[PDB]
Amino acid sequence: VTFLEKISERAKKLNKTIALPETEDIRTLQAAAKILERGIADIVLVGNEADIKALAGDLDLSKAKIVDPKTYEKKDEYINAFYELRKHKGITLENAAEIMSDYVYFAVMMAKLGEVDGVVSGAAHSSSDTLRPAVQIVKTAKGAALASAFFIISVPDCEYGSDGTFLFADSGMVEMPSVEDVANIAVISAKTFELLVQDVPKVAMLSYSTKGSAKSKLTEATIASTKLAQELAPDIAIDGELQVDAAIVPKVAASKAPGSPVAGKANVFIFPDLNCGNIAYKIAQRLAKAEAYGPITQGLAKPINDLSRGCSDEDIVGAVAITCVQAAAQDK
């Protein structure tokens, strides 16, 4: 069974509201009219009234909720709260009226205030433009130094990871993580694995080196980050530096890194930077026939996800479903 089928089913059990801002694109409506249709969640649409019922065509959205930045009965405290976290960044009140009238923003500040549980977009903008709303308004969770991105990778005939399932991170967002930032990526991705795959994360800090099989600036960066992460999170089994083969293969691990809590069992792969992360994941997907999921964001304070530039609405129902389960990571 599919990770996304598993997830979307778990996501139906919950009750969560997802504010989709891309209300001028007709995919973000094909998506919208299947959320309410399967019980995946409830879902806000952020944008002009003239768009909705006229654009998509004939699809039932009475189950949906329309809120325009210039219609809602609370729109005033949005130009105000935005101006409270841009309180240090040069933008006045009518500039806080220029930025906010955009749909992405209103969908994001609704999350910050708990009017909405989460946000999915990226499909019609990019991964530069999308994450600003996610950073400036939402900010991050407490046990989190940054917003990062990741991918769930399912490898077909595979006796590695968690039944062929892995989290790769960061493979989306963070171009050049510093050693501090890497260590945190490990910790935060462990909690995401647990949440989404529902298995014990064994986190591998990757490298061409394995426990000093080589030595350079590169290795030492990872070395350090392993050991930073091992402190941040003692309860989480975390090791580095590991090559991939030692990371996943008992026989190999047994000789390259004897008595490791991770080597030979890995299911979370952590990369030195985004050349590595993004190469690794595409290589899995295309040469290993792995199914890939993401980019999904993590370490955020309330879930807000990005989308591959070009995609279908069936992917979006996927993303919306993850934004739900994610949305059930703190409320307890």
Ligand X SMILES: CC(C)(COP(=O)(O)OP(=O)(O)OC[C@H]1O[C@@H](n2cnc3c(N)ncnc32)[C@H](O)[C@@H]1OP(=O)(O)O)[C@@H](O)C(=O)NCCC(=O)NCCS
- Which member of 34, 195, 308, 328 binds ligand X (CB under 6 A)? 308
Should residue 34 be labelled a site residue for ligand X when binding is judged by CB under 6 A?
Answer: no
> For ligand X, which is the closer residue by CB, 190 or 300?
300
Rule CB under 8 A: which of 193-212 touch its own copies? Answer: 206-208
Q: Which does 284 bind (CB under 5 to 8 A by kind): its own copies, ligand X, none?
A: its own copies
Should residue 65 be labelled a site residue for ligand X when binding is judged by CB under 6 A?
Answer: no
Provide the phi-psi class of 54: left if phi over 0, else alpha when psi is between -120 and 50, else beta. alpha
Q: Which does 200 bind (CB under 5 to 8 A by kind): ligand X, its own copies, none?
A: none
Rule CB under 6 A: which of 161-180 touch ligand X? Answer: 172-175
- Distance (Å, rounded) from C-alpha 202 to C-alpha 264? 10
Pairing of strands 119-120, 291-298: unpaired
Should residue 162 be labelled a site residue for its own copies when binding is judged by CB under 8 A?
Answer: no
Min separation Cβ 285 and its own copies, Å:
7
- Distance (Å, rounded) from C-alpha 292 to C-alpha 238? 23
Residue 282, φ and ψ in degrees, nearest 5: -55, -30
- Which member of 22, 51, 239, 306 binds ligand X (CB under 6 A)? 306
Should residue 240 be labelled a site residue for its own copies when binding is judged by CB under 8 A?
Answer: no
Should residue 243 be labelled a site residue for its own copies when binding is judged by CB under 8 A?
Answer: yes
Should residue 103 be labelled a site residue for its own copies when binding is judged by CB under 8 A?
Answer: no
DSSP secondary structure letters along 160-180: STTTSEEEEESSSS-SS--HH
- Which member of 88, 255, 258, 331 binds its own copies (CB under 8 A)? 255
Fill in the per-residue mask, 243 to 272: x = in contact with ligand X (CB under 6 A), - = not in contact.
Answer: x-x---------------------------
CA distances from 280 to 93, 104, 142, 330 (A): 45, 31, 29, 30
> For ligand X, which is the closer residue by CB, 54 or 287?
287
Contact 36, 63 (CB under 8 A): yes
Min separation Cβ 62 and ligand X, Å:
27
> For ligand X, which is the closer residue by CB, 67 or 168?
168
Residue 88: other Cβ atoms inside 10 A: 5
Contact 324, 40 (CB under 8 A): yes
User: How far is CA 77 from its chain centroid?
Assistant: 28
Should residue 151 be labelled a site residue for its own copies when binding is judged by CB under 8 A?
Answer: no
* Sheet strand arrangement including 148-154: 237-242, 202-206, 268-270, 165-169, 148-154, 291-298
Should residue 89 be labelled a site residue for ligand X when binding is judged by CB under 6 A?
Answer: yes
Query: Helix (H, G, I), strand (E, B), or coil: what is residue 20?
Result: strand
- Distance (Å, rounded) from C-alpha 291 to C-alpha 254? 29
Nearest to 244 by CA among 221, 224, 222, 270: 270
Please give the residue ranges that form the binding site for ligand X (CB under 6 A).
Answer: 89, 126-128, 131-132, 135-136, 140, 146-147, 149, 172-175, 243, 245, 278, 285, 292-295, 297, 306-308, 311, 315, 319
Please give the residue ranges that form the binding site for its own copies (CB under 8 A).
Answer: 127-128, 155, 157-158, 160, 164, 171, 175-176, 206-208, 214, 216-219, 222, 243-245, 248-249, 255-256, 271-280, 282-290, 309-310
